């Protein structure tokens, strides 16, 4: 028997024996993630048991899709998949898929609250943008970047966890339900950078109504060319709000909050004013953000269908052995 079972909450992880001392570090939709020691690599890893991958076609095609993308979108700033396996030894039996990934040291939640120099601030942002660029290259728009989704190591390396609650980092066009593009994820980057500087969630609130208010309170009402673009119902709420001018970037992010230092401060603020843009058509792109003076200092080119359940099991199993 190559496998053993460990009970984790109301879940059992049946894992290869090389994975030892399993302990929970995550609990969220998709499910329990356990940290573990990998005896063969002499390294800590994270093990995720996919949730009910053969519950239905929808779950199956999404499992298969998750597998293929993790197996071939590799990059220094996306958490790498180290192994995948099943404890079941036939298709008849096949139920569970286990993903083994890199384990870093922490979330951004920690780091956001600590005060960081421009070097670290902007190097972290550079890595974020690079990881996001590779995702998009692979055709993956994240839509839910946030600090708990982004992980860091003690040598200032940064990776993005995966690809889709805290709704504070989600872009206005999601909030408003208007459809979205790649630079949906630039807003989130703006929110995380803003919070790194101010040390407080930029746009809190109970719900999306409260959310929007904080956005307009601080950034000002978007213009009519944004509103026209809204579905009529959402356009009628959004046009009845107070017509705020916005607090302006120098006052949302004064020199005071920062640690060249004045024209590193003002570069940071300029980058923030180009990401924290309500209108996606007027918001900076990943390529442009990477090209910004604040981030560009680190630039290194080297870094920048219908099937039955049975039929899906066949395809997924092929991927597990790969």
């Amino acid at each position: 028997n190559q496998f053993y079972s460990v009970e984790v909450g109301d879940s059992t992880f049946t894992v290869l024996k090389r994975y030892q001392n399993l302990k929970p570090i995550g609990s969220g939709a998709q499910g329990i993630v356990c940290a573990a020691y990998d005896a063969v690599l002499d390294r800590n890893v994270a093990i995720k048991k996919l949730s009910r991958p053969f519950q239905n076609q929808t779950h199956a095609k999404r499992a298969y899709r998750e597998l293929v993308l993790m197996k071939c979108v590799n990059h220094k700033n996306i958490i790498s998949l180290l192994n995948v396996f099943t404890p079941q030894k036939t298709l008849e039996e096949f139920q569970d898929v286990y993903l083994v990934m890199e384990l870093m040291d922490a979330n951004l939640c920690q780091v956001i609250q600590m005060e960081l120099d421009h070097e670290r601030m902007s190097y972290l942002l550079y890595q974020m943008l690079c990881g996001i660029k590779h995702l998009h290259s692979a055709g993956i728009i994240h839509r839910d970047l946030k600090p708990s989704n982004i992980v860091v190591k003690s040598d200032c390396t940064l990776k993005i966890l995966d690809f889709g609650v805290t709704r504070y980092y989600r872009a206005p066009e999601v909030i408003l339900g208007m459809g979205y593009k790649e630079n949906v994820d630039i807003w989130s980057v703006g929110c995380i950078m803003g919070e790194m500087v101010r040390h407080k969630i930029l746009f809190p609130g109970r719900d999306y109504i409260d959310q929007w208010n904080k956005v307009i309170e601080q950034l000002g009402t978007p213009c009519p060319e944004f509103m026209k673009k809204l579905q009529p119902t959402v356009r009628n709420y959004v046009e009845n709000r107070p017509k705020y001018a916005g607090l302006t970037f120098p006052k949302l992010f004064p020199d005071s909050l920062f640690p060249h230092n004045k024209l590193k401060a003002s570069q940071a603020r300029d980058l923030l004013s180009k990401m924290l843009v309500i209108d996606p058509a007027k918001r900076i792109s990943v390529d442009d953000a990477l090209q910004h003076p604040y981030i560009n200092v680190w630039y290194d080119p080297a870094e920048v269908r219908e099937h039955t359940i049975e039929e899906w099991k066949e395809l997924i199993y092929k991927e597990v052995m790969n």
Binding site: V111, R120, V152, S154, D155, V297
Partner: peptide, 10 residues
């Protein structure tokens, strides 16, 4: 340019 190699997560 020399990128940082430390981050005090501790």
């Amino acid at each position: 340019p020399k990128r940082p190699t430390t981050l005090n997560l501790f």
